[model samples]
Target: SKGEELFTGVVPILVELDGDVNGHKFSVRGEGEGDATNGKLTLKFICTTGKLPVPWPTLVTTLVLCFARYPDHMKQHDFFKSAMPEGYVQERTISFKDDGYYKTRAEVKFEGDTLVNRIELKGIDFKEDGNILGHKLEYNFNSHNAYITADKQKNGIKSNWKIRHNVEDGSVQLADHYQQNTPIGDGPVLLPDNHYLSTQNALSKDPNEKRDHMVLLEFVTAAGITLG
Candidate 1:
């Protein structure tokens, strides 16, 4: 005698995000049909990568330029025991799937080529009778927007992080969902790689239209840190 109404319909899902940063291998597959009145929610997750190296304004030239591309005789303070703590930002959530992909997936860590931080996430647990039902996906971190677009060869500096989404007559949309590209291995270079970043907060029009209503995660955001 509780609240059991699991939507009077059918729900099927199959989301994925196979990862392996070391050798560089990524995945973000999907398939769903969650219903309960047009699915009862939507998605909204956006991300972009490639060309990130423009931050060495201080902090010891961003820790002496990620070891200055290594091999300046290689000493470089002996690696400094994996340093990356000045303003470190390394997220993680790995993987998940069910009735509808929640949180979706994530990953963005490097070391071989530099950037000693981390990032990984993958969540989705929509269960009512099974006891796993209670989701959340709200964002507006001060209308957070990332637009790097750096360009300076010389073996260092190639930024391109123009991420935006606002299509409903508002124009500009690189990803509102259905964007995936994975190329890790030499460090950074994978944008528009995550999709599904919404849990219904209601905001019709566009400006990302609540990130496509329910899910919007476009992958990729990796580059040898120090965007200087």
Candidate 2:
């Protein structure tokens, strides 16, 4: 009795960056069931890069531009100061019981200075123990993917943006994950805005299988936003 599945540890995460996000605003608000209980949770986190005079590029934008629309002007890594970062930012949420009376029992709302984007995560956490978790995140852009990379052989976990996505497939294939001719930054497919990424890793934690068994979604904008 010396070992217990200790998955609950105070995880201290930091997202500090000295970059520019141009002038765009991002706000997210949604809540649903969590933990092993049938209980529900709701939250709202906003970010505002304060809209710019001109449109900024998609991939080349600074960290600031990427999270400009967050609440309280909390751009960059400062937005994760809340209670739960995974539920608010990283992961997604959905509801279980669905009724015609309330189509969206769980939802995430986004309001930009220019327009508002609303996403209703139907049947969130339906398979609370299933693969491909649901999230309440909404966006106005298209073709986007995110991940973290590290070269344990060369520089350890200090590698910068060396981690990327595979355009053909919605997978965040790392540079060291495979050996192919898909260029350096050409890997793991990034789904469109109207689309979301799905992962089987939740069920099958097989590192190898997890590399290829990932799906994505594009909810709002049309396709062709950006592959990587």
Candidate 3:
């Protein structure tokens, strides 16, 4: 049996990223379905609150970069065609799905090993680096895992970003996942009125002090359950 077959199937998922913008809460939430067989995936971004200083395009791009490949974090690997190292023979096919979405199929081979048989993607835009773009419903990939790459411009600089997942492991990851960080304080505290005094300030008084925001993403499967 191909060890990779364990990664194939349909996976329904929810993605969320939350943080604070200038002490106000900002968040992004997405829900959709993905087909591991062909790597067809879809998601819609919903910004809940806390206006980000950057534009949505740039904000989304940065958050996506942090979450892509999930379990793997977009590192080099043999699981997918795009993740294959150099000197590999890669073949890809693009077509339209019945849902009025385009699909992509890819295969990568090297050293007598086939890294990918077929992967698909949906709700993505193909661009020529600020030159042109493929119109689509949303921005959204598998080997049992699939992936898709898109051009992104941040602050007038252009680059590519990718997203993908492992079908079988997707469910497990969410089930076993735990929050990495807890809130700094469990409950509110009443501080003295002099807390803000120059000699006894409770918060940083520096004008240039960097404010940090926390980001969190939660995933849940919606379709194609192979696990009992």
Candidate 4:
């Protein structure tokens, strides 16, 4: 077979396209090694989907921020006394009984042009025997203080009131004294005396007006308290 001779012919070509997807027949030409051997080809595509709006579930926080500061019972309280304007009372004395210690109560009230708020808080020392029995440490009303303020933050959940106490005798300060500014003394210190006195005059219009400012709870006093 090596004695014979062989002969062959060949041609190379090229092509190009410049049109749109729906255009007439364009470049049907060819180039490169694919024209010489006619091998394989490939194609690919990618895309993104659409989306919808998403809202937040803030109803609880909004409700709290809206109506949280106002107490519904503010109006029903004894305004001239327990819930009176600039009115407050403290434990005149502490008594112990049933192995526990208890102090008297104080109720205070604050008001604005359109609305009024009242806070009546109670105070009692923790006892072990579940009774006010023997001598126990006295934690006065200052230790157990609460208040109501305007919706300064406009969030109705809460208001703020500074504690204004008159420690006429005892050394005991209000509770959470160190936790916040605990102002102690006589006179309407933190509260505006004029505004309070004005409200008092509004209610006590008659010189012999009868207003209940004190609530005597039928509870034991400091005598015998047990702590463990």
Candidate 5:
């Protein structure tokens, strides 16, 4: 019987909470027709059967308010249902591995910052075949087209560095182009620019004198790559 109901929600519904539980006279009685967008709760609760009494009037108050204010169940259900997909990499990036590079679909999540414990990023993690370099990249799903970090090794991770993230274009700016004895610079790397210039000033025996050549991976399409 839908008799003497305790209404809940914006479009509130009747809940039959007047029943015995845990050997206690836990009863909630109210007299009201269920609801409208406009709502009210006229509840009378006797929360105990013995010497120790409990409270539950506002217990139901918080329940209705929480669901009304933040409907997380329905909202997050859609994020995974729509955003999750499979992956296959194509040659939009100028790195001519016609076999191309591939990564699994990004992992999307909502994490809180340690400082204030507030939510941020709805961030998505991107890695090429598990490890992009040694690190992984984080794409700001909110910004839609921005990658907040790049997989880095030595110089640590570079932030932004004017990198372009145009997925539709046939290129992406993965990193800054530096030159030295390093990969893009003055060190040992497979790229052609590891051929550091043969000059007394150009080479370094001590890291103090090591050249900090900077390279920014700018997007290019119609041009071939040249030595730094």
Candidate 6:
């Protein structure tokens, strides 16, 4: 037999990429390492961008796909290799819960311009009582609309006044909106008015001749740098 060799400890890794999504500039950076056998790897990826044409969460996931790579043994099948702007489905369990010390299961998917995300939470009685509750969020970029629906039909989902995003102005608008109806507080009461009022605006042109709804957006610039 040939002489045996053994190696121990972590190996350092660094990856960097720069690209554009529909003319919008973006950069990706990651740092981590894998075992000598290349069995398992861990990495943290940060994508720097000022804005994305798609929904934030969906865009983030797609940007992550831009970094997928396969080791030599797995490259024959192109295992896990992917391009940006692709589709995917994933599920996970989480420690954060809504009511008391509960647990949650989440499902997230992205296909084209459509996004489906659902979170299910179970109370402490989940073990034997089977008590469960949660909410759903859906976005249809093909139709330029998004909606938040809950276990209770309380939000504008009943009247069909969804949050509408402007493709041209980079703004968002919601009519017949109330926070307390969904899991938060009531408002037309803008919190920390300086931030909201400075960057966002309330509009009124619904024939009521008065302020009926609000639209708000805040943009910040970001730059990318490598860690190692």
Which candidate ranks first by lDDT, i.e. highest? 3
Report residue 94 deviation for candidate 5 (angstroms).
57
Cα RMSD, each candidate: 21.3, 20.9, 23.1, 41.6, 28.8, 22.6
Q: Write the per-residue lDDT of candidate 4 for residues 1-228, one digit (tens) a residue.
A: 110011011112121212111111111111211110111111110011111010001000000000111122221211122222333332222222222122222222222311111112122443432211111223122212223322223211121222222233443222221111111222222211111100000101223423311111111111111224
Global lDDT for candidate 5? Answer: 0.19
The clash number for model 4 is 33
Candidate 3's displacement at residue 206, Å, is: 43
Candidate 3 structure, TM-score to reference: 0.28
Output the better candidate (1/3) by lDDT: 3
Cα miss at 137, model 4 (Å)?
22
Scored against the true structure, residue 116 in model 5 reaches a CA lDDT of 9
* Per-structure clash totals for the candidates: 42, 42, 11, 33, 18, 1
lDDT: worst 10-residue window of model 2 = 99-108
Error of 6 at 145 (Å): 34
lDDT by residue (119-188, candidate 5, tens digit) is 1111123233322222222321011121212223542111121223322234442422211111112322
TM-score of each: 0.18, 0.19, 0.28, 0.17, 0.18, 0.23
lDDT of 6 by residue, 102-207 (tens): 2223232223322223333332322121111121212222222212122233321111222232323343322221111121222211111001100111221224
Report the alpha-carbon TM-score of model 1 versus the true structure: 0.18
What's the ranking of the predictions by TM-score, best on top? 3, 6, 2, 1, 5, 4
User: Residue 149's C-alpha lDDT in candidate 3?
Assistant: 26
Off by over 4 Å in 5: 1-10, 18-22, 31-53, 57-66, 71-228
Off by over 4 Å in 1: 1-89, 92-110, 114-119, 123-164, 169-228
Report the Cα lDDT for candidate 4.
0.18
Judged by whole-model lDDT over C-alpha atoms, candidate 3 comes out at 0.26
lDDT per residue as tens, model 2, 1-228:
101111122211112112121112222221111110111111121122332211111111111111111222211111111211111212122111221110111111122211112332122112322211222212112333333232334211111122232322343322111111111122222111222111111111224432212111112111122444
